[PDB]
Design brief:
Belongs to the peptidase M2 family. This protein has 606 residues and is an all-alpha fold. It has 22 helices and 6 strands. Helix content is 58%, strand content 3%. It binds a molecule of 4 linked components (NAG-NAG-BMA-FUC), the ligand CCCC[C@H](N[C@@H](CCc1ccccc1)C(=O)O)C(=O)N[C@@H](Cc1c[nH]c2ccccc12)C(=O)O, a molecule of 2 linked components (NAG-NAG), a molecule of 2 linked components (NAG-FUC), chloride ion (CL), magnesium ion and 1 more.
């Protein structure tokens, strides 16, 4: 470790811990920057030489975390929990958590190599037909989204899950063992326990289950309504009106957002078309425009614009040279208080416009708390970070706002239009809830040992059927590793944050609309240009993790806990409507024929 990066000596009292944290921040910013930079060089230009540089940067970070983690223990183990400065208690608590730095050198290198190899496998996988080969983004994504051929959709779904999942399984087994070994030395029973501890709630899993119980009826009714719509297009042979939906027919590779099948379920097509993708294309929208439109919403709230370093450094389009990239959208903080970037293979679609807002929500957070101690530069909890951009997109998606930005010529305020809009939003927000919930249930079982490698896929599809009510369109077995075909698994990114975010964003929305002075239906609110709403939001963003999220939340929404009532209130109209339609259509809610799988096409795969 560079001598300038090594910890000195500090008094074993709170006054010395303050200087300890100051010296830590100075050195930590340099170690974080070089690490994030090396990750950026790889993810924007996947080469072996850049992967090698990234693994060495990870080794340096582990060396740094070991020297400062063990110094923080030696000096402050019996007294840090009693410090008067609460932000300083949080800094020390983070520094003394070594994570992968608890591993011996050899296993550190194994650990860093696995993460690198797993990331490279996921982002370089292809579905070859043998020279012609399709990538996940854009090729397979567009097939899942715009194709209505059961066989073509099946080819892409099966192709992707086989190409990405199968080679990942042996690596994911080794990573899980090393991850658990590392965090067991921090005092956690397994890695999942460490991940859950970020929410500082002894009742976390019970609170999540109680939230999902309130939301499940909404998903069940949407599920039955969409399944009926698919049955009218695909027939009785490929859709079982009392069974799960084949997982490749919902517009998305993971059946996690159903927006792409809106055209098949829109109840009142005579009303304005809320899918403005065709208009964006007709008008000539490009990537940089989508980001400028997103930025302009943020500045309308008196939040910060994107700095020059963002526009000069960001990758907002898939490179057209001979570069392999990680196309999965992401927002980057380089921890130097200057460089902030988004990496996204942006496509001109309505859903991609929301993704742009989601990612810029991260950047805005980074910009607002960049002056806090490096350890406090994160969300109050990870769900907060995932909710910022989505709250703004809830206003952007309103028919009235789409009209203002020239994407919707006719604006109507009638009940039929309300149902159209709320159904479209439900295809995106309600359909996701089961998936956002189940991913880390699977990963928690893997970390705990409940789910050994011999049951990776068995338990994955138990949960997919249990919560989402979908089924694989081809037979699967334990050679397949379908969980690994989802970006966040090989990239080791927790997922429960997204379930928290989809509930939280409606709490934020309700509070910001109240703050803005809006007194109409919650789903028609648009906080555009509300400096008051911006001031309330800014207060959350500038807090970082300096304060417990329960208190940050109460200051914002008046409640110190996640609550599903705002989401239910947002959707009340279409919730009632979907129940009426399903009753009138004699639908069966749920999938009692849980064992059913669709047959294979007669001409498959040829
Ligand atoms: C779309 O339209 C709804 C409904 O509008 C209402 O019903 C129509 C059939 C007409 O009779 C309209 O004249 C009538 O307003 C709008 O929601 C409504 O917004 C108004 C404010 O613009 C609300 O009135 C306020 O209500 C609060 C109490 O909540 C009072 O304190 C205020 O003094 C004021 O009266 C009204 O409650 C609200 N109605 C419902 C059912 O939510 C909606 O704003 C509109 N959408 C857009 C984008 O304009
Ligand atoms: C909308 C943002 C998509 C990209 C995002 N990308 C991640 C980068 C993660 C990362 C961490 C560390 C290192 C590298 C990468 C992010 O920004 O959080 C993402 O993954 N969203 C989720 C859920 C979701 C939100 N809104 C939706 C709307 C519809 C459907 C799903 C979701 C998903 O798509 O599964
Ligand atoms: C992708 O990364 C590689 C490094 O792995 C870059 O290649 C280097 O380019 C510089 C200048 O062009 C040369 O001096 C080095 O010798 C190259 N190294 C290797 C290993 O080839 C490459 O330029 C990067 N590509 C992009 C588009 O940034
Ligand atoms: C796992 O399955 C692989 C692919 O074939 C699968 O099983 C056959 C019977 C068909 O149902 C087909 O649609 C499926 O995709 C096999 O190649 C592989 O041998 C299987 N692995 C084990 C361990 O049996
Ligand atoms: Cl999380
Ligand atoms: Mg779409
Ligand atoms: Zn995010």
């Amino acid at each position: 470790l560079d001598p300038g990066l090594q910890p000195g000596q500090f008094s074993a009292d709170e006054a010395g811990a303050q200087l300890f944290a100051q010296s830590y921040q100075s050195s930590a910013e340099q170690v974080l920057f070089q690490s994030v930079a090396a990750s950026w060089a790889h993810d924007t230009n996947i080469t072996a030489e850049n992967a090698r540089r990234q693994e060495e940067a990870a080794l340096l970070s582990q060396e740094f975390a070991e020297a400062w983690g063990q110094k923080a223990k030696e000096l402050y183990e019996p007294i840090w929990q009693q410090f008067t400065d609460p932000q300083l208690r949080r800094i020390i608590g983070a520094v003394r958590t070594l994570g992968s730095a608890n591993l011996p050198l050899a296993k550190r290198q194994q650990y860093n190599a696995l993460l690198s190899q797993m990331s490279r496998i996921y982002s370089t996988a292809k579905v070859c037909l043998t020279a012609t080969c399709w990538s996940l983004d854009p090729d397979l994504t567009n097939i899942l989204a715009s194709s209505r051929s059961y066989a073509m959709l099946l080819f892409a779904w099966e192709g992707w899950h086989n190409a990405a999942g199968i080679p990942l399984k042996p690596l994911y087994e080794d990573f899980t063992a090393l991850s658990n070994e590392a965090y067991k030395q921090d005092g956690f029973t397994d890695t999942g326990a460490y991940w859950r501890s970020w929410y500082n709630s002894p009742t976390f899993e019970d609170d999540l289950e109680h939230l999902y119980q309130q939301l499940e009826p909404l998903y069940l009714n949407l599920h039955a309504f969409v399944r009926r719509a698919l049955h009218r297009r695909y027939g009785d042979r490929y859709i079982n009106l009392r069974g799960p939906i084949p997982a490749h027919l919902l517009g998305d590779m993971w059946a996690q957002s159903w927006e792409n099948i809106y055209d098949m379920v829109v109840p009142f097509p005579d009303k304005p078309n809320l899918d403005v993708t065709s208009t964006m294309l007709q008008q000539g929208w490009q990537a940089t425009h989508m980001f400028r439109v997103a930025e302009e919403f943020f500045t309308s709230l008196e939040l910060s614009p994107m700095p020059p370093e963002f526009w000069e450094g960001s990758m907002l389009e898939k490179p057209a040279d001979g570069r392999e990239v990680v196309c999965h959208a992401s927002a980057w903080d380089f921890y130097n208080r200057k460089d902030f970037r988004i990496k996204q293979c942006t496509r001109v679609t309505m859903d991609q416009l929301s993704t742009v807002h989601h990612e810029m929500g991260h950047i805005q957070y980074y910009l607002q708390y960049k002056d806090l101690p490096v350890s406090l530069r994160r969300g109050a909890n990870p769900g907060f970070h995932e909710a910022i951009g989505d709250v703004l997109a809830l206003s952007v998606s309103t028919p009235e706002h789409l009209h203002k930005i020239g994407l919707l010529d006719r604006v109507t305020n009638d009940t039929e239009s309300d149902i159209n809009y709320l159904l479209k939003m439900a295809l995106e927000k309600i359909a996701f809830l089961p998936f956002g919930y189940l991913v880390d249930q699977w990963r928690w079982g893997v970390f705990s040992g409940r789910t050994p490698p011999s049951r990776y896929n068995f338990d994955w599809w138990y949960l997919r059927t249990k919560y989402q009510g979908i089924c694989p369109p081809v037979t699967r077995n334990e050679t397949h590793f379908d969980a690994g075909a989802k970006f966040h698994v090989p990239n080791v990114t927790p997922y429960i944050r997204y379930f928290v975010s989809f509930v939280l964003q409606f709490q934020f929305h309700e509070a910001l609309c109240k703050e803005a002075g809006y007194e109409g239906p919650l789903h028609q609110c648009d906080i555009y240009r509300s400096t008051k709403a911006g001031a309330k939001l800014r207060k959350v963003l500038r807090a970082g993790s300096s304060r417990p999220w329960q208190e940050v939340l109460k200051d914002m929404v008046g409640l110190d806990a996640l609550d599903a009532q705002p989401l239910l209130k947002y959707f009340q109209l279409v919730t009632q409507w979907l129940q009426e339609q399903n009753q009138q259509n004699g639908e069966v809610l749920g999938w009692p024929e849980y064992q059913w799988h669709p047959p294979l096409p007669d001409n498959y795969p040829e």
